[PDB]
Amino acid sequence: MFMINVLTLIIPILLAVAFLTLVERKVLGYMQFRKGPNVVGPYGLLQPIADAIKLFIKEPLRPATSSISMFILAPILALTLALTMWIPLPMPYPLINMNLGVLFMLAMSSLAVYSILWSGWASNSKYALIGALRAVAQTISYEVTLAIILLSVLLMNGSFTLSTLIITQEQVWLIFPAWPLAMMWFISTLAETNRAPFDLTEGESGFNVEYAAGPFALFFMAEYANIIMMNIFTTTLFLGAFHNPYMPELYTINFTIKSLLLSITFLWIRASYPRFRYDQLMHLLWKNFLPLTLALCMWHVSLPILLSSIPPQT
Amino acid sequence: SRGEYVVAKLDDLINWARRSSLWPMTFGLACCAVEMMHMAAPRYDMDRFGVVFRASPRQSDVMIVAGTLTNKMAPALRKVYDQMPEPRYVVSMGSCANGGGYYHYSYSVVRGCDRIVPVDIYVPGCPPTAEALLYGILQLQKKIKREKRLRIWYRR
Amino acid sequence: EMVRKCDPHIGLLHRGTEKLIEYKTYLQALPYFDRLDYVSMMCNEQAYSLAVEKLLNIQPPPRAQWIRVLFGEITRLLNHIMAVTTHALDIGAMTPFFWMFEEREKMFEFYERVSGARMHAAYVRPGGVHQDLPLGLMDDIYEFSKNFSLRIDELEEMLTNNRIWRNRTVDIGVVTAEDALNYGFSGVMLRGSGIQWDLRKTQPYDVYDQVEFDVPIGSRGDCYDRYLCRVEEMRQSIRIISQCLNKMPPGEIKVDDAKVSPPKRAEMKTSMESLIHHFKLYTEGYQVPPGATYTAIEAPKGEFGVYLVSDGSSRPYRCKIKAPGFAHLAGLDKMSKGHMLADVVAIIGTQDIVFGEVDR
Amino acid sequence: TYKYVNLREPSMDMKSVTDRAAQTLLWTELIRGLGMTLSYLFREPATINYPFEKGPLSPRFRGEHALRRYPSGEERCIACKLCEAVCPAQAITIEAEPRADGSRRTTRYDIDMTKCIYCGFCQEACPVDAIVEGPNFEFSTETHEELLYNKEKLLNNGDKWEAEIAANIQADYLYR
Amino acid sequence: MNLMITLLTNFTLATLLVTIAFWLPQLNVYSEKTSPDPMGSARLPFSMKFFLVAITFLLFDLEIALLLPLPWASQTTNLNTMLTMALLLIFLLAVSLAYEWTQKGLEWTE
Amino acid sequence: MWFEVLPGIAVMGVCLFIPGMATARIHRFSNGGREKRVAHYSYQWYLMERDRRVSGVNRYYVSKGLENID
Amino acid sequence: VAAFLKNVWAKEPVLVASFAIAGLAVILPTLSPYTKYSLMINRATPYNYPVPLRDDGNMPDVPSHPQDPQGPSLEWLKRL
Amino acid sequence: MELLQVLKRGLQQVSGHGGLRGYLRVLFRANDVRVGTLVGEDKYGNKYYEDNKQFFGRHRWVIYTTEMNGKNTFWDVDGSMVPPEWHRWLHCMTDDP
Ligand SMILES: CCCCCCCCCCCCCCCCCC(=O)OC[C@H](COP(=O)([O-])OCC[N+](C)(C)C)OC(=O)CCCCCCCCCCCCCCCCC
Ligand SMILES: CCCCCCCCCCCCCCCCCC(=O)OC[C@H](COP(=O)(O)OCCN)OC(=O)CCCCCCCCCCCCCCCCC
Ligand SMILES: CCCCCCCCCCCCCCCCCC(=O)OC[C@H](COP(=O)(O)OCCN)OC(=O)CCCCCCCCCCCCCCCCC
Ligand SMILES: CCCCCCCCCCCCCCCCCC(=O)OC[C@H](COP(=O)(O)OCCN)OC(=O)CCCCCCCCCCCCCCCCC
Ligand SMILES: CCCCCCCCCCCCCCCCCC(=O)OC[C@H](COP(=O)(O)OCCN)OC(=O)CCCCCCCCCCCCCCCCC
Ligand SMILES: CCCCCCCCCCC1=C(C)C(=O)C(OC)=C(OC)C1=O
Ligand code: SF4
Ligand code: SF4
Ligand code: SF4
């Protein structure tokens, strides 16, 4: 019965990642004054199915890897960590209702850089390894502002419990007291997922260009699971919805609409901006977001004390 | 028999999925690149057919040779074609890719890209219009639709 | 991260164009110029036509000159749309590419209505243009021009005040004026550095002394001022197109020397001299008097010139093609020193480089 | 007669400095760009439904070649080799002889469509309107030699497309 | 226990999809490929700057590890000392950032 | 036009709606028509194990009220 | 000192906002009338059992019942 | 409210193809459901439609026949299935069908 709950979590994750690709191609079509896919299915609804069947019977590139074992373990780790970030998500009830769900998510997203690192070293190209090291350095850079923005917000929560974050936002959204944290958080989640304007794995060859089309589709679907997940986590964190404990589907519809609009905001940002040069997003992290994030971390430490609004522990 | 029916339905499935998700690697060699970009432009929009805009060469399904193949770039074309995973296809766009074209008698031009790679669709024009190139891509999809891989495998 | 040396190896589209010109007549060698700067077709047609007409001691009729300047500025819009939108597509702004290629598609419809081909028209010929405008074309060019300023406005809304676009272009590819003159740069590559030089002002050709337009001058020599110069040249090209539509004269469109331009088919099928002239212009071709000219225009990439040598026959003895991309890509190595690997793609963008005219 | 792009010295009073700082911190031009992209989201796209909807053309359009006939069945081509003399790519190969009734007619009229540059110099060199470059652009092949047209293929293209070619010439011959 | 079941299910689904993606096109008998990089054969050049940003991540991440018990630390009854030491740790992270700034450590990956 | 993208958004939104609705209904099915007991702290687990012992049927969610005393 | 402020607010407004927010976070808890109430609320929160006192006979300020008048009251927290 | 007029136009596009069966027929063959004025039908079964309210490029279309010269063109529609007398009109070489 619990395994039914695990499958009703993880199989709709795979379906929503399948159709996020279609939604991205359609929304980027209409924002680029064209259509998206509308031939393959009715309104293109069979485009992800056709494309998945195409990729799973495409020939393997059959490369020379330094490690066979890390070449197998990098997609396994990417998919496993992409699926374990969902299990504490309170929507309105988490699958695993853990007391440190925020810190668990922060740790399991910190572990996601080994997929990039192991897949880069598993490729024998030195250029793929250099691009992998640039992607890892970008990601661990933006993890700093993830951790500190998240800490500064949870100073208003009182605990690392994700389910308490619904109770925190019953009177107001937490984007009202923490909109600078919210906007730096949103750009930091944009830079965690190698998402445009921070997609330097498509700027002129990434880390996973040496895989077959099947494992490349697995990396791709882990990345889009991370995108949908970080939008849901941002929605829980700043745009927390109303919850009737006798009608949980009201909260589910509300956070689902907000998370869809936030994922479409990711799609709409990649359809609007040029890329950063690599040192420019290093400049954006280390010289712009991190001083503001430390200043607001001091502010959200000292502000519940000066207003007498320290939240409860329990 | 029953196995004949199963390989017929499975060939129909895999051919549907391969033709309905063609990913092109376009060689922007010469003027035909501009008309490929018009076949990607919002009037014609290859992406509504599932034909994405600028897939990377290690994951592409068709190689659209759009422009003049000179002798100095013939091994680069061959190397990219060798790096493409199967089933790979090659569309020859325009007269210089087809038969050398206006530079057929030149000292420096490969007389048609068919001397270097096997070619599936020859799209004629100088340049062929973006509608004519889209016609050639739909004819390539019809060529993939009538492939008989598992049926010939079941008969071999 | 820094670029110490940039060595551009070219010749990957060297097709021996101007040796193939040496065996073909002047009419036969006209459509090679459509394919050199293959986003600027009728401008290169105009440069070759002006070279041949300068060597022939004839001149086009006034309506031919106004049609050539009209379609030269339509061509200038085509090339600056290609330039700005692919320069943004390579950096990452993929969306105004698709927004501007519909207006680009409508101008290719203008080419196809006037000649029959969407790109390589072979329409501007030595003597004038090949064929007159069809009825209703100038109304549709007016309906295009009435709306194209808003397309430039929304392109400029996307890119110009955007801080990410400014961070990719503001201190990148800075060329001093003295180095831009010494490296043989032309067009925007000069005018971005503050050099007040445009060939349609200084050495004017067909009716550019009769149209009124401004010349955008940059102030920092960077990728960003060259971007703003190309956007403002789209503005001023719309201005020239309005002045060409209002001041289009009546009259013939070929020179009325039937020993240079072919007669009409109605008189070719009726008159003996016109059939003889039609025969000899489409088999032998006209003879050009012996001499070497250097005729250059302000193409949308810069000074596009032809050093054309006739020996008296109906085929060129020599046809050297000066293109701006050759000198600009020779200056690529200087312009990328002290910059980064993602700045070199912005420098290859701000030099509007098409390798058909680079490699010939 | 010239203008200075980017020669604005920005105002340094507290109003304009606070405006630029609000633009930097509150990302006003980024929301402007998002608004323009959102404005295209709700426009109708420019995408026609090929193959069912076709791109607009004109009677001058230069597509697939065809040999034409008179309104009696007699072919117009009288073997004068002007089209292959003017042909800039030498796509046309012509051999001729007098046929059984003594008419000047071709026995070889080849057009290599993979040398052809589709510029239509042949149809304007032609003094009898025999060769035309017709309206068809959808004639892609699966094999290279299916684009090496002989006289039979060009005459069949003329018989196939004459009802359209004649009306396009009727639309355009007064400009010629 | 439910967490171990969930981790095992996620790992098993990931390993299953990886095995399917690595062995479903192996059933095809396509062809044997011979196929005889921007760098030609040159050794991987070390860059000091990537190592500096990785160590700067590690040091600020240790400072983050100190900062992580603050939502529980605000519940204390020694609030003046807690607030002083909290502002002092964020200030020392800021001073580490300023020293990394002003000695050109944040340059060419700024 | 722009409502052509809404079928894919509807499919993806139903797929995002499914896990929360599923875990709410499975928690109410597995816990006596009520929410799952949240035991983050050892006092809550202590009362929960007390409920499992005082229910008699080894299920904490079987509640016993005034009828279980005299 | 006023020209320096406008100069750095024109050049580096991120750092001006950073040092302004940091300076407010430093000085403002020592200026607020509510900082006393944070301590008062944290000591009013009963994590532990209130272990009773053996009544010796003379403790007039220790109640015998929770609803007795003597003892610490939290009407200040109910009102605020 | 003008959303109601939009939905009524969608319902009469369902009605305009002769109900849900012909509606889904043109939806899965044309990837397009809008109704037009039937300009004509050739000797093959290709049907030609106008809608001058559509923008220039959408305003003329063809619904290809399901069988032409022995071939089953139900799903395999082809741009070269258009006869030359309709090829002027469909490619907008003339105003005249
Ligand atoms: C979670 C829901 C959504 C949240 C909002 C996000 C939605 C909108 C997203 C739009 C698309 C963004 C795409 C990526 C853009 C990346 C570039 C970018 O923006 O860089 C950030 C830029 C970077 O600066 P820059 O690069 O533009 O400027 C140049 C920088 N120097 C000078 C160093 C060279 O700005 C920031 O870092 C600002 C971050 C937020 C700051 C919030 C400040 C709040 C107010 C403080 C007080 C101010 C008043 C004075 C004191 C008063 C005291 C009482
Ligand atoms: C949470 C919900 C998630 C939902 C996700 C999916 C959303 C979209 C679902 C699909 C919508 C309808 C798609 C219909 C496609 C067209 C099918 C069709 O008609 O194919 C015709 C083809 C050939 O037929 P033929 O007889 O030759 O035609 C000649 C007629 N004179 O015949 C064939 O090709 C053979 C028949 C193939 C039928 C395939 C139909 C679609 C399959 C979709 C699978 C997934 C559906 C969702 C599963 C979960 C919910 C149940
Ligand atoms: C190359 C190898 C393969 C790589 C791919 C697979 C591995 C990577 C992806 C999976 C990562 C596994 C993470 C396991 C622990 C996660 C942390 C954790 O347990 O947090 C949840 C929770 C803490 O919150 P709390 O509510 O306080 O505890 C319950 C008290 N009421 O704590 C609990 O609820 C406690 C539950 C019981 C304890 C669980 C212990 C799990 C088994 C040990 C680790 C197994 C994995 C080892 C390898 C890890 C990666 C290297
Ligand atoms: C014992 C018998 C069974 C044997 C095993 C078979 C397993 C089931 C396989 C699916 C059914 C078999 C038929 C497959 C399609 C063949 C028919 C076909 O392609 O018809 C063409 C038609 C569209 O026509 P077309 O010419 O492509 O369009 C031009 C544009 N007007 O195409 C259509 O209308 C759409 C066709 C859709 C194909 C089916 C739906 C997608 C696949 C669903 C099953 C696999 C899903 C796996 C999971 C994917 C990832 C979530
Ligand atoms: C006291 C409270 C706690 C204070 C400590 C914690 C603050 C939280 C934020 C931490 C920031 C850490 C890094 C700060 C480094 C500052 C030095 C610096 O960056 O100098 C160099 C810079 C010129 O920049 P450059 O060298 O070119 O670097 C590339 C970017 N252009 O030079 C500059 O940009 C000049 C910047 C310095 C002047 C800033 C003045 C701000 C005034 C705000 C209002 C008053 C605040 C009062 C607080 C004390 C101020 C000293
Ligand atoms: C368990 C398998 C589920 C299906 C596989 C993932 C969903 C399909 C995504 C297909 C896809 C699309 C559309 C796509 O556009 C794309 O290119 C950017 C991919 O990466 C290679 C993709 O993988
Ligand atoms: S076939 Fe002709 S128009 Fe096309 S790229 Fe070649 S030269 Fe240019
Ligand atoms: S269109 Fe031009 S290249 Fe083609 S056959 Fe005619 S003259 Fe020769
Ligand atoms: S097609 Fe015309 S130009 Fe060519 S040989 Fe025949 S009659 Fe002469």
Q: Which residues are C2's β-sheet partners? A: C340
Sorted by sequence, the CB contacts under 8 Å of residue A137 that are 6+ apart come out as E50, E53, E54, E57, E109
Chains E and D touch, contact meaning at least 3 pairs of CB atoms under 8 angstroms apart: no
CA pair distance D116, D155, nearest whole angstrom = 17
The secondary structure of A143-165 as a DSSP string is HHHHHHHHHHHHTTTSSS-TTHH
| C267 close to C92: Cβ distance less than 8 angstroms | no
Asked if F36's CB is within 8 angstroms of A26's CB, the reply is no
Residue A297: count of CB within 10 angstroms of its CB: 29
Is residue A92 reached through a cis peptide bond, with omega within 30 degrees of 0 on the bond before it? yes
∠ CA B20-B23-B27, rounded to 5°: 140
Q: Which residues are A62's β-sheet partners? A: none
> Token digits for B141?
């999809």
| A95 close to A88: Cβ distance less than 8 angstroms | yes
CA pair distance C343, A203, nearest whole angstrom = 12
CA pair distance G59, C165, nearest whole angstrom = 77
CA pair distance C186, C302, nearest whole angstrom = 5
How far B48 CA sits from the closest chain A CA (Å)? Answer: 4
Is A124 an 8 Å CB contact of chain B?
A: no
Chains H and D touch, contact meaning at least 3 pairs of CB atoms under 8 angstroms apart: yes
CA B51 to ligand 6 center in whole angstroms: 13
Task: Kindly list the strands in the beta sheet with H37-41, ordered across the sheet, starting from the edge strand earlier in the chain.
Answer: H37-41, H47-50, H60-63
State the greatest distance between any 2 C-alpha atoms of chain E, in Å, as a whole number. 74
Sorted by sequence, the CB contacts under 8 Å of residue H37 that are 6+ apart come out as H49, H50, H51
Cα–chain center distance at C5: 31
Answer whether G44 contacts ligand 5 (Cβ < 6 A): no
| A55 close to A214: Cβ distance less than 8 angstroms | yes
| Residue in A31, A276, A278 closest to C164 by CB | A276
- In chain C, which residues have their Cβ closer than 8 Å to the Cβ of E109? 1
Which of E57, E76, E80, E100 to mutate to probe the A interface, most A CBs <10 Å? Answer: E57
CA B14 to ligand 4 center in whole angstroms: 8
Neighbouring chains of B at 3+ CB pairs under 8 Å are: A, C, D, E, H
CA pair distance C219, C212, nearest whole angstrom = 23
CA B91 to ligand 8 center in whole angstroms: 23
* D84 Cα nearest atom in ligand 9: 4
- The one-letter amino acid code at A123 reads S
The secondary structure of D100-145 as a DSSP string is TT--EEEEEEEEETTT-----HHHHH-TTS-EEE-S-----BSSGG
CA A18 to ligand 2 center in whole angstroms: 16
User: Which one of the ligands is nearest to B102 CA?
Assistant: 7
Which of G8, G14, G39 to mutate to probe the A interface, most A CBs <10 Å? Answer: G14
Using DSSP's 3-state secondary structure scheme, residue D45 falls into coil
Q: List the one residue out of B89, B111, B81 whose CA is nearest residue B99.
A: B111
Q: List the one residue out of D89, C7, D94, D144 whose CA is nearest residue B109.
A: D89
Answer whether A80 contacts ligand 3 (Cβ < 6 A): yes
Give burial (CB, 10 Å; 0-12/13-18/19+) of E11.
middle
Sorted by sequence, the CB contacts under 8 Å of residue D169 that are 6+ apart come out as D59, D129, D132
Asked if D12's CB is within 8 angstroms of G9's CB, the reply is no
Cα–chain center distance at A25: 19
CA pair distance E22, E40, nearest whole angstrom = 29
Residue with tokens 């800039």: D88
- In chain C, which residues have their Cβ closer than 8 Å to the Cβ of A33? 98-99, 102
CA pair distance G6, F57, nearest whole angstrom = 74
Residue B154: count of CB within 10 angstroms of its CB: 16
Which of B29, B34, B65 to mutate to probe the C interface, most C CBs <10 Å? Answer: B34
| C297 close to C315: Cβ distance less than 8 angstroms | no
- In chain B, which residues have their Cβ closer than 8 Å to the Cβ of A36? 47-48
Task: Check the CA dihedral C200-C205-C209-C213 and report its sign.
Answer: negative
CA A49 to ligand 2 center in whole angstroms: 11
The secondary structure of C279-298 as a DSSP string is HHHHHT-PPPPSEEEEEEEE
Q: Technique behind this structure?
A: cryo-EM
> Token digits for G17?
């906002």
> Token digits for C166?
């400014």
- The one-letter amino acid code at D58 reads S
Q: List the one residue out of C191, C203, C215, C207 whose CA is nearest residue C245.
A: C207
Indicate the domain borders of chain E.
Answer: 1-110
Query: First-to-last CA distance in chain F?
Result: 71
Q: List the one residue out of A170, A171, A157, A184 whose CA is nearest residue A102.
A: A157
| D6 close to C228: Cβ distance less than 8 angstroms | yes
Answer whether A98 contacts ligand 3 (Cβ < 6 A): yes
Shortest CA distance from F3: residue in chain D: D42
Is C8 an 8 Å CB contact of chain B?
A: no
Alpha-carbon distances of A115 from A108, A147, H46, rounded to whole Å: 12, 20, 55
Question: HSE on the CB side for F50, CA within 13 Å?
Answer: 7
Is D176 an 8 Å CB contact of chain A?
A: no
The secondary structure of C17-31 as a DSSP string is HHHHGGGS-HHHHGG
Answer whether A14 contacts ligand 6 (Cβ < 6 A): yes
The secondary structure of E31-98 as a DSSP string is --------SSS------HHHHHHHHHHHHHHHHHHHHTTHHHHTT-S-HHHHHHHHHHHHHHHHHHHH
Cα–chain center distance at D80: 27
User: Which one of the ligands is nearest to D115 CA?
Assistant: 8
Q: List the one residue out of B32, G78, H28, G73 whose CA is nearest residue C120.
A: B32
* G25 Cα nearest atom in ligand 5: 2
Chains D and G touch, contact meaning at least 3 pairs of CB atoms under 8 angstroms apart: yes
User: Which one of the ligands is nearest to A286 CA?
Assistant: 5
What is the helix (H) or strand (E) element at residue C37, kind and residue range? none
CA C109 to ligand 4 center in whole angstroms: 38
Sorted by sequence, the CB contacts under 8 Å of residue B113 that are 6+ apart come out as B65, B69, B77, B90, B92, B97, B98, B119
Beta strands in chain C (DSSP E): 124-125, 128-129, 215-217, 291-299, 302-310, 316-322
CA pair distance B72, E26, nearest whole angstrom = 36
Which residue CA neighbors atom 4 of ligand 7 most closely?
B127
CA pair distance C79, C100, nearest whole angstrom = 11
| C170 close to C160: Cβ distance less than 8 angstroms | no
- In chain A, which residues have their Cβ closer than 8 Å to the Cβ of F18? 8, 12
Phi, psi dihedrals of residue D3, rounded to the nearest 5°: -140, 160
CA pair distance C326, C314, nearest whole angstrom = 29
- In chain D, which residues have their Cβ closer than 8 Å to the Cβ of F2? 41-42
Residue with tokens 């240079």: C260
Q: Which residues are H41's β-sheet partners? A: H47
Q: List the one residue out of C279, C293, C296, C301 whose CA is nearest residue C190.
A: C301
> Token digits for A223?
């990345």
Alpha-carbon distances of C66 from C72, C246, G41, rounded to whole Å: 10, 10, 86
User: What are the residue ranges of helices labelled H in B69-120?
Assistant: 74-82, 94-99
Indicate the domain borders of chain A.
Answer: 1-314
Query: First-to-last CA distance in chain E?
Result: 45
Packing angle of the helix pair A213-238, A179-192 (nearest 10 deg): 170
Question: HSE on the CB side for A291, CA within 13 Å?
Answer: 22
CA pair distance C238, C256, nearest whole angstrom = 31
Among left, alpha and beta (phi > 0; psi -120 to 50; other), residue B104 is: alpha
Sorted by sequence, the CB contacts under 8 Å of residue E20 that are 6+ apart come out as A56, A214
CA pair distance D88, D84, nearest whole angstrom = 8
- In chain B, which residues have their Cβ closer than 8 Å to the Cβ of H57? 43
Residue with tokens 């300047």: C69
Q: List the one residue out of C127, C296, C125, C128 whose CA is nearest residue C204.
A: C296
Alpha-carbon distances of D171 from C135, C252, C254, D168, H87, rounded to whole Å: 11, 19, 21, 5, 15
Give burial (CB, 10 Å; 0-12/13-18/19+) of C311.
middle
- In chain H, which residues have their Cβ closer than 8 Å to the Cβ of B131? 79
CA pair distance G17, G5, nearest whole angstrom = 11
Query: First-to-last CA distance in chain A?
Result: 29
Cα–chain center distance at D83: 19
- In chain D, which residues have their Cβ closer than 8 Å to the Cβ of H63? 52
A:210-249 residues touching chain B, CB 8 A cutoff: 210, 212-213, 216
Alpha-carbon distances of C86 from C100, C169, C350, C359, rounded to whole Å: 11, 14, 10, 20
Q: List the one residue out of B123, B120, B102, B124 whose CA is nearest residue B111.
A: B102
Residue H96: count of CB within 10 angstroms of its CB: 7
What is the helix (H) or strand (E) element at residue A74, kind and residue range? helix A68-84
CA pair distance F57, F44, nearest whole angstrom = 20
Neighbouring chains of G at 3+ CB pairs under 8 Å are: A, D, E
CA pair distance H61, H69, nearest whole angstrom = 21
E29-55 burial, b if ≥16 CB within 10 A, otherwise e? eeeeeeeeeeeeeeeeeeeebeebbee
CA pair distance A299, G23, nearest whole angstrom = 9
Shortest CA distance from A30: residue in chain F: F2
Q: List the one residue out of A17, A9, A5 whose CA is nearest residue A226.
A: A17
CA pair distance F37, C4, nearest whole angstrom = 65
CA A80 to ligand 6 center in whole angstroms: 17
- The one-letter amino acid code at D26 reads L
User: Which one of the ligands is nearest to B6 CA?
Assistant: 4
CA pair distance C174, C195, nearest whole angstrom = 14
> Token digits for H15?
């009605």
Among left, alpha and beta (phi > 0; psi -120 to 50; other), residue H61 is: beta
CA E83 to ligand 5 center in whole angstroms: 23
CA pair distance F4, E66, nearest whole angstrom = 51
Sorted by sequence, the CB contacts under 8 Å of residue C53 that are 6+ apart come out as C59, C60, C126, C127, C255
Phi, psi dihedrals of residue H48, rounded to the nearest 5°: -120, 130
Is F19 an 8 Å CB contact of chain A?
A: yes
Cα–chain center distance at D150: 22
Q: Which residues are C128's β-sheet partners? A: C125, C254
Q: By 3-state DSSP, what share of chain D in percent is helix, strand and coil, each rounded to 5?
A: 40, 15, 45
CA pair distance C75, C39, nearest whole angstrom = 8
Which residue CA neighbors atom 6 of ligand 8 most closely?
D122
Answer whether H75 contacts ligand 4 (Cβ < 6 A): yes
CA pair distance D56, H88, nearest whole angstrom = 10
CA B61 to ligand 4 center in whole angstroms: 19
Asked if E94's CB is within 8 angstroms of G42's CB, the reply is no
Answer whether A183 contacts ligand 1 (Cβ < 6 A): yes
Is A33 an 8 Å CB contact of chain B?
A: yes
| D88 close to B103: Cβ distance less than 8 angstroms | no
How many Cβ contacts (< 8 angstroms) between chains A and G?
56
Strands C316-322 and D92-98, bridge-based pairing: unpaired
Which residue CA neighbors atom 31 of ligand 2 most closely?
H74
How far C131 CA sits from the closest chain B CA (Å)? Answer: 20
